[PDB]
Amino acid sequence: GSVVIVGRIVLSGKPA
Amino acid sequence: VEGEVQIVSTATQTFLATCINGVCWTVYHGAGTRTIASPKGPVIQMYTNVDQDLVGWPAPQGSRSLTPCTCGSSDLYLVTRHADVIPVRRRGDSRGSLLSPRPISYLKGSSGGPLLCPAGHAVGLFRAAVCTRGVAKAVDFIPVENLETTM
């Protein structure tokens, strides 16, 4: 098996 | 927009990873010896340290590394996989007590996440929750000093 990245957290709260 | 904290996932379990100093760190009891997926095929761990419950791959795309704490502070903040911030007073090199204990479910899936000092810098990775009867009152963590030496 393998670890997959399913989402991300931005600590600064920076908007896209 | 890049994230310091990636939300990772095994077939059988889900946790977090924290990017520090260009490495993507997380807990051994979650990743094991696994590889992290990438758009070019599986990537292997740069670091495995079953002793400290720690693995590290190269930082993925869409990530931003966290800075190691130098604040020395005892007022930490745990970030959960829901992006909740939990204040924790530090008790020891690798132990800290929630300021307001939460159900255990609240902290669930949030290991491998960061403990930050007031400046936002990494103090450690959330390692395991210490519960009395389903109520997390404190946490274990891999102090960042461990990551820095593992390198």
Tab-separated table of C-alpha atoms in Angstrom, chain A residues 5-15, chain B residues 1-8 15-19 60-66 78-85 108-114 116:
chain	number	residue	atom	x	y	z
A	5	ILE	CA	-2.577	13.126	0.273
A	6	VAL	CA	-6.307	13.815	0.478
A	7	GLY	CA	-6.396	17.498	1.362
A	8	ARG	CA	-4.302	20.389	2.669
A	9	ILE	CA	-4.208	22.833	5.552
A	10	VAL	CA	-2.792	26.359	5.295
A	11	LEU	CA	-1.978	27.694	8.768
A	12	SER	CA	-1.954	31.355	7.705
A	13	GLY	CA	-5.522	31.040	6.442
A	14	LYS	CA	-4.384	32.373	3.058
A	15	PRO	CA	-7.202	32.401	0.425
B	1	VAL	CA	-1.700	28.837	-2.066
B	2	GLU	CA	0.510	26.278	-0.306
B	3	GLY	CA	-0.171	24.296	2.851
B	4	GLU	CA	2.224	23.389	5.665
B	5	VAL	CA	-0.031	20.595	6.867
B	6	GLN	CA	-1.183	17.872	4.499
B	7	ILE	CA	-4.107	15.588	5.321
B	8	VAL	CA	-2.881	12.069	4.481
B	15	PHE	CA	-3.946	11.148	9.894
B	16	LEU	CA	-1.928	14.292	9.101
B	17	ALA	CA	1.598	15.094	8.001
B	18	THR	CA	3.536	18.284	8.774
B	19	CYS	CA	6.145	19.753	6.428
B	60	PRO	CA	5.175	17.127	-1.871
B	61	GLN	CA	4.000	19.725	-4.363
B	62	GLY	CA	1.511	22.155	-2.848
B	63	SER	CA	3.447	22.317	0.405
B	64	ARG	CA	5.257	25.024	2.390
B	65	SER	CA	7.658	24.083	5.192
B	66	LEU	CA	7.156	25.149	8.816
B	78	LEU	CA	-2.501	21.913	18.410
B	79	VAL	CA	-4.031	22.026	14.952
B	80	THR	CA	-6.483	19.198	14.227
B	81	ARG	CA	-7.332	17.623	10.879
B	82	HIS	CA	-10.378	19.924	10.825
B	83	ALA	CA	-8.082	22.930	11.211
B	84	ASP	CA	-9.255	23.429	14.772
B	85	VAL	CA	-6.780	25.133	17.079
B	108	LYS	CA	-9.127	11.853	16.313
B	109	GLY	CA	-7.238	11.637	13.039
B	110	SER	CA	-5.105	14.639	13.912
B	111	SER	CA	-1.819	12.943	14.740
B	112	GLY	CA	1.184	13.921	12.676
B	113	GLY	CA	-0.240	17.423	12.961
B	114	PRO	CA	1.813	20.379	14.334
B	116	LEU	CA	2.819	25.563	17.241
